[PDB]
């Protein structure tokens, strides 16, 4: 109409550009994105290396399993303040958390009075009770188990934990650690914690991650249509 001869050609460019944008915006919306966190010596490297791989600063790992595309952002190289770049991770399906069971009698460097489990619990509290992650579930991993058994065998558990009434048995020590970690969860009605013990079999770990993701997807779909 009012547009000139070549002005209508520029409007056609906007249409194909918007089409190409919408086509790519839908392909990246059907893949599961999950964040990874943990301490420096929490065994995150052995976890990211043991699992299947297909692929400074942020690092992204892309792998597929059971016709699902997973993205793993390892935010470990950021030495700046965490409160500044944490709001861009608002949309995420899960938050992988990794801690070390055997790392409970080893004090943190340049310090002789503070245990590493203390700052581990502090980081877990800051992550779970954050004002942004009030709806995303948390998957929890225990990296080492055999070294933990050897350590509780040669060293008592009462050195790290000030109160303890049970015996020096791994079967009850693991349950105590799990109950202590699940206690630091204020939002007990909007999020859940799935715990697991890392074993030598990668298939079990991948299956557990897939099961947790499927459970989160089912819960999200149920909450989507207001069915529960």
């Amino acid at each position: 109409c009012t547009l000139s001869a070549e002005d209508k050609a520029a409007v056609e460019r906007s249409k194909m550009i918007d089409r190409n944008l919408r086509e790519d915006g839908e392909k990246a919306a059907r893949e599961v994105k999950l964040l990874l966190l943990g301490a420096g010596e929490s065994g995150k490297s052995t976890i990211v290396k043991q699992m299947k791989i297909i692929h400074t600063g942020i690092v992204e790992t892309h792998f597929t399993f059971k016709d699902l595309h997973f993205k793993m952002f390892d935010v470990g190289g950021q030495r700046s303040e965490r409160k500044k770049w944490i709001h861009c991770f608002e949309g995420v399906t899960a938050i992988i958390f990794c801690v070390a069971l055997s790392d409970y009698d080893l004090v943190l460097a340049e310090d002789e009075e503070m245990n590493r489990m203390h700052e581990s619990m502090k980081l877990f509290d800051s992550i779970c009770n954050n004002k942004w992650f009030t709806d995303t579930s948390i998957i929890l991993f225990l990296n080492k188990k055999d070294l933990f058994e050897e350590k509780i065998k040669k060293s008592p558990l009462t050195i790290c934990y000030p109160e303890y009434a049970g015996s020096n048995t791994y079967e009850e020590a693991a349950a105590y650690i799990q109950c202590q970690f699940e206690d630091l969860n204020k939002r007990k009605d909007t999020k859940e914690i799935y715990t697991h013990f890392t074993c030598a079999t990668d298939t079990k770990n991948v299956q557990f991650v897939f099961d947790a993701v499927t459970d989160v997807i089912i819960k999200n779909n149920l909450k989507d249509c207001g069915l529960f």
Partner: peptide
């Protein structure tokens, strides 16, 4: 945007001119 695009808009006519993609969507 966090989607990974660097769209260049035209203020007068509202049409788009480019859709430069990005390597890292952050």
């Amino acid at each position: 945007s966090q989607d990974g695009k660097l769209i260049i808009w035209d203020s007068y006519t509202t049409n788009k001119v480019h859709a430069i993609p990005l390597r890292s969507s952050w």
